[PDB]
XYZ file of C-alpha atoms in Angstrom:
565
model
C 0.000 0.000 0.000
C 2.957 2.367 -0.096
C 2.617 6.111 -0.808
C 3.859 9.266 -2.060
C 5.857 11.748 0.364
C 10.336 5.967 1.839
C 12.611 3.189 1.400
C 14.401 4.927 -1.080
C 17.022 7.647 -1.559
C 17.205 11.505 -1.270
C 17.865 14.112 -3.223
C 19.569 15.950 -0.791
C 20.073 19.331 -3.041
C 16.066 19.132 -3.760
C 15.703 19.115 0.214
C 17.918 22.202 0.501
C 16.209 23.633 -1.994
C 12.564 23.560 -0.159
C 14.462 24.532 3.026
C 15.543 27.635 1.591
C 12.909 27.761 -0.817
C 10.567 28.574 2.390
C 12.778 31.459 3.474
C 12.357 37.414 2.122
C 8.714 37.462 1.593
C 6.973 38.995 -1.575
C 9.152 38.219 -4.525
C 8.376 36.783 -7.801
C 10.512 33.564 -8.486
C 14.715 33.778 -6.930
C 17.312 31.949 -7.593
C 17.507 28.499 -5.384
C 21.295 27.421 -6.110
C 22.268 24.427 -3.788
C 25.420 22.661 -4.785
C 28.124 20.293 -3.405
C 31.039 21.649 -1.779
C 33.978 20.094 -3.083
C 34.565 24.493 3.279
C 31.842 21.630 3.606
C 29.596 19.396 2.261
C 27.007 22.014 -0.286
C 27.068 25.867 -0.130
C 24.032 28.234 -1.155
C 23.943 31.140 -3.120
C 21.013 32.753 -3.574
C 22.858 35.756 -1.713
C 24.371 36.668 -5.311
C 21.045 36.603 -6.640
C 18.062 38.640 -6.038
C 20.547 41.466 -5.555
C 18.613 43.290 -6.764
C 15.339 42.780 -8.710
C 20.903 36.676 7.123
C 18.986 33.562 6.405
C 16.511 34.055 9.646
C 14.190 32.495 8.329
C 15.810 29.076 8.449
C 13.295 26.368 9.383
C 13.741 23.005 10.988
C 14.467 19.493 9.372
C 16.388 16.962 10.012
C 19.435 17.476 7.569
C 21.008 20.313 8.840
C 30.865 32.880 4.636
C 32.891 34.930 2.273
C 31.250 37.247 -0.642
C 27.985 35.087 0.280
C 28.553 31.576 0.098
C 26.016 29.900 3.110
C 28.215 26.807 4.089
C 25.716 23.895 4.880
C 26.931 21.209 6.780
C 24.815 18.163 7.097
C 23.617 16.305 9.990
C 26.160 13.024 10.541
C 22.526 11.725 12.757
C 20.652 11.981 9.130
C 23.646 10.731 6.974
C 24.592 7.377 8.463
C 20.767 6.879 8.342
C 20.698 7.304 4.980
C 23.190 4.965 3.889
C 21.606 2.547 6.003
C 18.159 3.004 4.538
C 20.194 2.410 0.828
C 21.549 -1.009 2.417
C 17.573 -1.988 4.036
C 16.018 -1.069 1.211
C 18.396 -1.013 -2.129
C 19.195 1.262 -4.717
C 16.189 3.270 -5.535
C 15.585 6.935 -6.526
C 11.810 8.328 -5.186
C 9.435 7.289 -8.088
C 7.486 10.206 -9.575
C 3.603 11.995 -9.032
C 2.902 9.554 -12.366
C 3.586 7.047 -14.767
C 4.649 9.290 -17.448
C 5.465 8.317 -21.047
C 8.288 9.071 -22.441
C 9.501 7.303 -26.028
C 13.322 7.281 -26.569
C 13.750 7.200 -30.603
C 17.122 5.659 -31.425
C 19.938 3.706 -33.321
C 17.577 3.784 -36.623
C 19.458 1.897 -38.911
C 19.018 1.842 -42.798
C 18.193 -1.271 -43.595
C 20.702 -3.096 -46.473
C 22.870 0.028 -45.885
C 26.105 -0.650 -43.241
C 25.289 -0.080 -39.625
C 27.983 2.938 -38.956
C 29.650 3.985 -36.055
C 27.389 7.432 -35.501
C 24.658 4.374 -35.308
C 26.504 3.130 -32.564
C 26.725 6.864 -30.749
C 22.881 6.557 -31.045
C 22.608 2.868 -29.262
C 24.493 3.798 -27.243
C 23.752 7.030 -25.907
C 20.213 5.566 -26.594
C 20.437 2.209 -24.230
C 21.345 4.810 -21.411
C 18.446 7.836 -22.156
C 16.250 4.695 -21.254
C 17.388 3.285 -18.331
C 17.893 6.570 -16.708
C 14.252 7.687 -17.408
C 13.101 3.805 -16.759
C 15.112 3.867 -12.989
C 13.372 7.170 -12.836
C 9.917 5.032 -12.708
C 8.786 6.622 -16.276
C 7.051 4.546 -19.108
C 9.716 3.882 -21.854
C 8.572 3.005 -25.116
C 12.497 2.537 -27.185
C 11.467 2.458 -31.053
C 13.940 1.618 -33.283
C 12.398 4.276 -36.663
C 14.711 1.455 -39.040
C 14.962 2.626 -42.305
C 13.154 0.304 -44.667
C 10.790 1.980 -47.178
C 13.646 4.192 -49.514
C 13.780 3.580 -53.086
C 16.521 1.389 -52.560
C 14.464 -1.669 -51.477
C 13.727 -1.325 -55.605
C 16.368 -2.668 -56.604
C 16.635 -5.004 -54.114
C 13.289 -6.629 -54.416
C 13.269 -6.751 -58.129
C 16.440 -8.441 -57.436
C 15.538 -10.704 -55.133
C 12.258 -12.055 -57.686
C 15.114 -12.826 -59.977
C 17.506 -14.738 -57.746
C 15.256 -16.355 -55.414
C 12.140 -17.182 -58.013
C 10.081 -19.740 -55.708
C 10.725 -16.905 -53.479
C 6.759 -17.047 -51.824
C 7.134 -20.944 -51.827
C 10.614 -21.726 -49.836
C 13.506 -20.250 -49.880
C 15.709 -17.604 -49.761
C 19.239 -18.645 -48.549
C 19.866 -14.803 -49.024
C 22.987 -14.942 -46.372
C 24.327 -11.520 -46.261
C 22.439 -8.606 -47.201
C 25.086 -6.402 -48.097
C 26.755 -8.679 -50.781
C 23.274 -8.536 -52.122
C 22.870 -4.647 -51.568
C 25.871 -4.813 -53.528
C 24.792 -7.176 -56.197
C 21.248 -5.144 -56.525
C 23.200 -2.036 -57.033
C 25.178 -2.742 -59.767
C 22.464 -4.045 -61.818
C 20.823 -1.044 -60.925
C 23.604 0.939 -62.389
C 24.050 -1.037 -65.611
C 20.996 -2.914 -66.771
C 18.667 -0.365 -68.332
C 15.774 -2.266 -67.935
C 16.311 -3.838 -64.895
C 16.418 0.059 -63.595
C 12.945 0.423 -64.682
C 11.885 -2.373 -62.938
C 13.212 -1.077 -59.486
C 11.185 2.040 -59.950
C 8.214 0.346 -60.521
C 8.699 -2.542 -57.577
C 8.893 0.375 -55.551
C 5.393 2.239 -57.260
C 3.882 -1.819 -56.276
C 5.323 -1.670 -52.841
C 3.639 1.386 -51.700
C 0.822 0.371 -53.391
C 0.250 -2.633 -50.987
C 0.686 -5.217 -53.358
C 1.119 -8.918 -52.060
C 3.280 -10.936 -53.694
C 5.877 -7.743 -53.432
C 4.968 -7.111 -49.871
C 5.909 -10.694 -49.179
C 9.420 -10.025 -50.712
C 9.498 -7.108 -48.718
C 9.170 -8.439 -45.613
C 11.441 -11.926 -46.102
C 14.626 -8.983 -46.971
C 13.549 -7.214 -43.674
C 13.959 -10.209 -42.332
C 17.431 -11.045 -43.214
C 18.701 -7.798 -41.519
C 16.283 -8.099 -38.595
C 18.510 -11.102 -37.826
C 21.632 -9.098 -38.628
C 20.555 -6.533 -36.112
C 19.744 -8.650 -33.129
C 23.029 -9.559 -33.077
C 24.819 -6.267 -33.295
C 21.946 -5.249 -30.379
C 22.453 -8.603 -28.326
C 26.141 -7.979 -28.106
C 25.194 -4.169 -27.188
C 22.608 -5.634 -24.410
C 20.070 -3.191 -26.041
C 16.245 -3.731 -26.436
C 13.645 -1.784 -29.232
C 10.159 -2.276 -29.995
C 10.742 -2.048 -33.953
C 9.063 0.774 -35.981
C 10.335 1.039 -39.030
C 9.370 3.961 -41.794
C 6.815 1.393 -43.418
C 4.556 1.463 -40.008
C 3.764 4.903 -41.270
C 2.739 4.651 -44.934
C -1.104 4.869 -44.444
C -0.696 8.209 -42.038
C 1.651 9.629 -44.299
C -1.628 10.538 -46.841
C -3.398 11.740 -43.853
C -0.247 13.842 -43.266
C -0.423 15.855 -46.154
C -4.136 16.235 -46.168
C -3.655 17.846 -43.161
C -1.373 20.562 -43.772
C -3.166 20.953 -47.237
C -6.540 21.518 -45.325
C -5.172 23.944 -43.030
C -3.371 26.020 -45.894
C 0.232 25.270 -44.933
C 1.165 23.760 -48.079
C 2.235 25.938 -50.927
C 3.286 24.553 -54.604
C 6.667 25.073 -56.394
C 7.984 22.544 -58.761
C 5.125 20.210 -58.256
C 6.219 19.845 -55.322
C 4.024 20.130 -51.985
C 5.954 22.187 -49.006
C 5.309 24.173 -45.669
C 7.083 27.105 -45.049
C 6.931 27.176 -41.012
C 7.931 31.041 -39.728
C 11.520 31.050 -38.611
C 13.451 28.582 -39.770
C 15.397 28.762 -42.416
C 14.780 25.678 -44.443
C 11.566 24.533 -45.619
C 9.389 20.934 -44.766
C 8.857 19.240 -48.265
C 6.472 16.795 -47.936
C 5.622 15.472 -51.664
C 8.067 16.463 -53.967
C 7.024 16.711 -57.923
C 6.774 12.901 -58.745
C 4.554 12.687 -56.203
C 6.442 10.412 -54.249
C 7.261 11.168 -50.264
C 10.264 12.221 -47.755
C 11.487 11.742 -44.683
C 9.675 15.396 -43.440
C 6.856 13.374 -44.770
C 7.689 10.350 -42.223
C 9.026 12.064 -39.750
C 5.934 14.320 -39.284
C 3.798 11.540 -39.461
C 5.669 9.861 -36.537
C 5.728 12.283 -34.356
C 2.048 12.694 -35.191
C 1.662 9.423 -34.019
C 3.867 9.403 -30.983
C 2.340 12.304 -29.598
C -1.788 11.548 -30.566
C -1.938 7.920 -30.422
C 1.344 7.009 -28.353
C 0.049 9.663 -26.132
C 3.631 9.921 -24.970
C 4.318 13.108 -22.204
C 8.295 13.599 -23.409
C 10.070 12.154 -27.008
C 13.363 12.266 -27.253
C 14.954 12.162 -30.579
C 19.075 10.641 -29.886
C 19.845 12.101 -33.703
C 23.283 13.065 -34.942
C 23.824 16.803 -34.205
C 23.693 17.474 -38.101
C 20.504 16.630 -37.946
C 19.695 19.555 -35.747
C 17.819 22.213 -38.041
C 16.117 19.516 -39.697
C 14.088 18.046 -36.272
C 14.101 21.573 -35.096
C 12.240 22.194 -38.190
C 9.908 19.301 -37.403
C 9.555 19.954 -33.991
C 8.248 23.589 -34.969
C 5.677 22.433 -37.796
C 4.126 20.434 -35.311
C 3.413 23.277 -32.857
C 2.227 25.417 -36.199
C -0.687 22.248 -36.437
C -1.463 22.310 -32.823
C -0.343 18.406 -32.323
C 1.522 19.681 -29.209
C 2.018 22.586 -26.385
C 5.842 22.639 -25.633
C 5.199 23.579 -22.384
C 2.845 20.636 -21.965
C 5.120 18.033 -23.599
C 8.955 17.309 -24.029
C 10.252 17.061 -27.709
C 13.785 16.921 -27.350
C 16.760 16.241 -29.749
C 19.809 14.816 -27.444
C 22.109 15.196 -30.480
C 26.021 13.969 -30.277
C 29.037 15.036 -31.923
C 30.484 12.654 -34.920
C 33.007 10.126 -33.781
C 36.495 10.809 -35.175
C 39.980 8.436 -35.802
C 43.056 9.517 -33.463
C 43.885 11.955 -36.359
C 40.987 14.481 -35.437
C 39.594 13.268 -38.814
C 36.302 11.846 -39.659
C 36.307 8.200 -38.435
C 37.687 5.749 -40.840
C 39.123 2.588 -42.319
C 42.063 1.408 -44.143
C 41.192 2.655 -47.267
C 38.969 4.967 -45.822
C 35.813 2.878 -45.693
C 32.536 2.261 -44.002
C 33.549 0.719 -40.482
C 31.062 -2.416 -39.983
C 29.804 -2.707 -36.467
C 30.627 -6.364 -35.917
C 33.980 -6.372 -37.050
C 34.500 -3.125 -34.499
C 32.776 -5.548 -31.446
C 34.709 -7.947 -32.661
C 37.495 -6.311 -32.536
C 37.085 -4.961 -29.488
C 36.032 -8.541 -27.828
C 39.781 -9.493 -29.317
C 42.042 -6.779 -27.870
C 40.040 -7.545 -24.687
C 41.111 -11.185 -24.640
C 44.325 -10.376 -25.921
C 44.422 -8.064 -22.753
C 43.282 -10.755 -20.640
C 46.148 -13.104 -21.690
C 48.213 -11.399 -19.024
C 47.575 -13.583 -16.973
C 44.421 -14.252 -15.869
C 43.391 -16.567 -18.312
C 43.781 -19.337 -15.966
C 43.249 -17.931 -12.909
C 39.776 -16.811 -13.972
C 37.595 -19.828 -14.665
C 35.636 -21.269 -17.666
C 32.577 -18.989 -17.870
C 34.039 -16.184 -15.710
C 36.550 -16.146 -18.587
C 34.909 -17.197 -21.758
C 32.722 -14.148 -21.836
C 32.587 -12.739 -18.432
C 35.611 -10.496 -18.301
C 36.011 -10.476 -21.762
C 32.588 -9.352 -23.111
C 32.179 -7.147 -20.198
C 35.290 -5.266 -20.466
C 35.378 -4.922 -24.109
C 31.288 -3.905 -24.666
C 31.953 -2.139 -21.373
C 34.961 0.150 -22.473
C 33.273 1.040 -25.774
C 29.937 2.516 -24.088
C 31.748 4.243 -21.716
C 34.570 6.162 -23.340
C 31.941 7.899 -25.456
C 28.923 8.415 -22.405
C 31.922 9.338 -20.307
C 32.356 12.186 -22.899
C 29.787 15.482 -23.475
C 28.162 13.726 -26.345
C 28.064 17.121 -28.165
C 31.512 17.101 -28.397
C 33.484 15.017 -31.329
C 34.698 12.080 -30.123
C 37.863 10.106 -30.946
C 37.506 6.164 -31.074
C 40.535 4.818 -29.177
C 40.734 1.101 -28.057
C 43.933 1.888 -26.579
C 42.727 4.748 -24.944
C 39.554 3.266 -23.580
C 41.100 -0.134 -22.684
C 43.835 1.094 -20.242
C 44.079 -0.175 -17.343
C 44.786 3.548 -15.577
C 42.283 5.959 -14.912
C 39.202 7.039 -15.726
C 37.944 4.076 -17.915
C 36.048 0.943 -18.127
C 38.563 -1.220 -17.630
C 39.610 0.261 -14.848
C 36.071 0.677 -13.003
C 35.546 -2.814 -13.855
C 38.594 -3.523 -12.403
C 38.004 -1.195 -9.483
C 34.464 -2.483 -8.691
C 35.982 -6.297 -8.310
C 37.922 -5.136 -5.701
C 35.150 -3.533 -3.617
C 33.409 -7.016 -3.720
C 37.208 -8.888 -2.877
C 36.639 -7.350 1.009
C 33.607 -9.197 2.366
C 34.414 -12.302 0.223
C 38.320 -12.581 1.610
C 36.793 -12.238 5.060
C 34.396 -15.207 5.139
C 31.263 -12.612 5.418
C 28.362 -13.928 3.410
C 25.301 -11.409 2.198
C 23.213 -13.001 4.662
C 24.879 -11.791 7.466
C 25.458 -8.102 5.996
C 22.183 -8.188 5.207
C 21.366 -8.706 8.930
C 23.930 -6.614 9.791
C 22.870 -3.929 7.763
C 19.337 -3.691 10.020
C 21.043 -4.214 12.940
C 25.193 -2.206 12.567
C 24.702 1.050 13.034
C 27.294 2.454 10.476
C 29.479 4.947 11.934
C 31.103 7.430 10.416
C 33.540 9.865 12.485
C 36.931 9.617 10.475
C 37.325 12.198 7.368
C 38.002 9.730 4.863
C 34.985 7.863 5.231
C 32.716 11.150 5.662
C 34.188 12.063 1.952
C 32.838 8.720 0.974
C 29.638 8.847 2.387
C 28.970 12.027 1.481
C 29.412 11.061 -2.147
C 27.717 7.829 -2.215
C 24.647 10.199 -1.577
C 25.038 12.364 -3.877
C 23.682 9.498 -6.831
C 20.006 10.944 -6.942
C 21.064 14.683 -7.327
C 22.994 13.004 -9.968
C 21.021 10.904 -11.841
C 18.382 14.070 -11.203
C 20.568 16.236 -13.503
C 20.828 13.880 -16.299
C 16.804 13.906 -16.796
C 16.612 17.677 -17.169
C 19.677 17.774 -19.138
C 20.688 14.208 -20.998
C 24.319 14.764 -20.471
C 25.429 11.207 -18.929
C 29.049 12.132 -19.192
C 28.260 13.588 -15.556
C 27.426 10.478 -14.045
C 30.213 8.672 -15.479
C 32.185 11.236 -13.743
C 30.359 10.474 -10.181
C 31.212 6.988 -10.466
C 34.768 7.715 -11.155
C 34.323 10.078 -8.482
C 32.813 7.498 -6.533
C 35.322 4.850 -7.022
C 38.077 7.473 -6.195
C 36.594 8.698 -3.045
C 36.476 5.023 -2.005
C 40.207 4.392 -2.585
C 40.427 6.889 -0.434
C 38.650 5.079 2.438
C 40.710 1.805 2.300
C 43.836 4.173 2.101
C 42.767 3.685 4.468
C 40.479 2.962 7.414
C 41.380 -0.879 7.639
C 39.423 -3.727 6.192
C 40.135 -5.952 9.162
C 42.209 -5.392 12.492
C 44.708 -7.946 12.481
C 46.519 -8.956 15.317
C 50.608 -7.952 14.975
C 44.665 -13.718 13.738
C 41.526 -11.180 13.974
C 40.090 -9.456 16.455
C 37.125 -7.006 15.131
C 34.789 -7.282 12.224
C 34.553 -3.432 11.232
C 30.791 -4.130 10.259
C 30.301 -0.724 9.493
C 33.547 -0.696 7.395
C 32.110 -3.918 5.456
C 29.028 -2.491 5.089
C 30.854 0.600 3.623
C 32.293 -1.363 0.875
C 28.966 -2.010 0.217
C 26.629 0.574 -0.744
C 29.502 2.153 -3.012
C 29.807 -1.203 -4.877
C 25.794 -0.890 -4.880
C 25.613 2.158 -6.108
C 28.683 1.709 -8.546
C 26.885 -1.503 -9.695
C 24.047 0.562 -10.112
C 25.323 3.406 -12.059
C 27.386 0.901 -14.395
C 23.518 -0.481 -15.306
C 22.403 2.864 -16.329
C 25.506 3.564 -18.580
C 24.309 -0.188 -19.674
C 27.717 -1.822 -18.479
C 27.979 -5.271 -17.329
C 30.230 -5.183 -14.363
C 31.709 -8.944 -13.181
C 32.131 -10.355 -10.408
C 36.328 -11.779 -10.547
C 38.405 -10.324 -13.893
């Protein structure tokens, strides 16, 4: 029957914030600025502000210099509570006042086209919008908007009636979709008449005709397989919606702007002007076929009438920023949403770049396919393995556990661990070293957190008891730095829904892991005897509680952390 107003963590910096927020009278809205102290532990500074347009007014909770800094110390009584109350009750932010919607739309691949490495930005970046605003107790719909309606699927479909005839009976062995991409294309580029064809399998295939459909539908197929495995390995899951699921509201798209006079002819072709920006939606161009505007206004049409989602959140590349800006504006021109009332956001991310500060290549300067990059990656991670663990670590802990977890692990972390605005080099040496602040080293440092209560014959079942019964004390400075940062995940993970910008709590868990280095150098694991004498419960139960946390901000960054290495 639990309730609203609790078993799970606190915002400390949104408490502050109603403390001072009652606190002077008669204003319209001031400035509420509460944030950590790197002195003591968060300072206010509302004392710049309202200057112009002696906090006596300070009421009582149970929490509780210079130009105008207010100092706040908190309360070690409500503290060592707290991180109690994370060990009773587990990780958990306070859910919200409802069950919000929010759709994350990301990775959208083209389908027969090479899955590229901004893709893998998006899935990435994508994976981690979600589980943020999923933690956060909101409603996450992840569509994957796959390309898979262009005029390229022409070609290919025409192609495929050729190679595969009894193609609606059995078959087709098709095997890999790009060698037949390939195959398609060159036809397409040398047999006149095959050309035409293309063009008009394309005419049948928006024009709902079966035995095309059917064709349709068995190429999706081969790449929906291809996929799965590029978003297994990437632990990453999307409700499919490809550009097809919207060729029936595309007409109704058109109609609509037509009907409300924001379509004007020019070539033929059908576009809206919308007032301020500086390129124009065209939505049927002269041969009367349709674009992506055309797609992409009929999506978020959808996502916003019959989705009835409260936020979207487009993860695009960020040179696709006029054009959803664009978008985003036509649809408050029709009325299909109040920006005020509903978040339509573009996280957009920088392109990802070779060591050179050049566009990201190959060897020749090719496309870079996905699942030779994993692969790759999955390699150099063995390869770093073979020093020596290899048979120290088991079967299974081995096989994959380490291996898979520090190679998918370093790649989704040395970009979230960057402002995703920003460019960003791809560096398997960079991300894979064993110093500082990457994966491999979090993974690393996270394995040692969990070697404390394991070398010292302390099971769960007995922290567990001991968590409800220890009372964990906290009087040294090293382990108030600790604790003070272990609490500090919700204002955290608070941030990152206003803003998207995971990159900060990437740099709390390094943070995190740093400040706990701190605490065994030191505070002693066990007191040894110059045998043992004391069980430092509290000092156990520290260890815990960061690795929770830590174990709980690798899930949101979607990293896999092990239990040996």
């Amino acid at each position: 029957g639990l309730v609203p107003r609790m078993a799970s963590m606190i915002n400390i910096i949104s408490r502050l914030q109603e403390v001072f927020g009652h606190a002077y009278p008669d204003l319209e809205n001031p400035p509420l600025l509460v944030t950590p102290s790197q002195f003591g532990d968060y300072q206010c500074n509302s004392a710049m502000g309202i200057s112009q347009m002696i906090t006596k007014h300070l009421p009582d909770n149970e929490c509780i210099a210079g130009p105008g800094f207010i100092n706040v110390h908190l309360r070690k009584d409500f503290v060592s509570e707290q991180l109690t109350s994370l060990l009773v009750n587990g990780v958990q932010l306070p859910a919200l006042g409802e069950n919000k919607k929010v759709i994350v739309d990301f990775s959208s691949p083209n389908i027969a086209k090479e899955m590229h490495v901004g893709h893998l930005r998006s899935t990435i970046i994508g994976e981690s919008i979600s589980r943020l605003f999923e933690f956060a107790g909101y409603d996450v719909l992840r569509l994957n908007h796959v390309g898979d309606w262009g005029t390229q699927f022409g070609m290919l479909i025409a192609h495929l009636q050729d190679k595969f005839p009894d193609y609606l009976t059995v078959s087709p062995p098709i095997g890999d979709l790009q060698v037949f991409y390939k195959e398609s294309k060159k036809r397409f580029d040398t047999e006149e008449e095959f050309k035409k064809r293309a063009y008009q399998c394309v005419v049948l295939l928006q024009g709902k005709n079966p035995d095309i459909t059917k064709a349709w539908k068995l190429i999706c197929d081969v790449s929906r397989q291809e996929l799965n495995k590029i978003y297994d390995a990437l632990d990453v899951s999307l409700i499919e919606r490809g550009e097809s699921f919207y060729q029936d509201r595309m007409n109704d798209i058109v109609k609509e702007f037509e009907d409300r006079g924001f379509v004007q002819v020019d070539d033929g072709r059908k576009i809206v002007f919308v007032p301020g920006c500086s390129i124009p939606l065209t939505i049927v161009k002269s041969d009367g076929g349709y674009t992506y505007d055309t797609s992409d206004l009929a999506a978020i049409k959808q996502r916003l009438f019959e989705e009835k989602a409260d936020m979207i959140i487009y993860v695009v590349d960020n040179g696709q920023s006029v054009h959803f800006q664009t978008i985003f504006a036509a649809a408050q021109m029709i009325g299909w949403y109040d920006p005020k009332v509903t978040r339509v956001f573009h996280a957009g991310f920088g392109v990802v770049l070779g060591e050179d500060k050049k566009k990201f290549k190959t060897r020749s300067g090719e496309t870079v396919r996905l699942m030779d990059l994993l692969g790759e990656g999955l390699k150099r991670s063995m390869d770093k393995l073979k020093e020596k663990e290899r048979d120290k670590v088991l079967t299974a802990e081995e096989l994959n556990a380490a291996q898979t977890s520090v190679a998918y692990g370093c790649i989704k972390y040395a970009d979230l661990s960057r402002n995703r605005l920003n460019d960003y080099i791809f560096s398997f040496d960079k991300m894979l070293d064993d110093r500082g602040n990457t994966a491999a080293y979090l993974l690393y440092a996270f394995t040692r957190i969990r070697s404390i209560a394991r070398l010292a014959n302390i099971d769960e079942e007995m922290l567990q008891k001991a968590a409800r019964e220890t009372k964990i004390l906290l009087d040294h400075e090293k382990e108030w730095k600790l604790g003070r940062c272990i609490l500090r995940f919700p204002e955290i993970l608070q941030k990152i829904l206003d803003d998207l910008f995971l990159h900060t709590l990437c740099d709390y868990i390094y943070e995190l892991a740093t400040a706990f280095t701190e605490f065994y150098d030191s505070c002693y694991c066990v007191e040894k005897d110059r045998k043992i004498l004391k069980v430092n419960m509290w000092r156990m139960l520290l260890c815990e509680a960061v690795a929770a946390v830590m174990a709980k901000g690798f899930d949101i960054l979607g990293i896999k952390p092990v239990q040996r290495m």
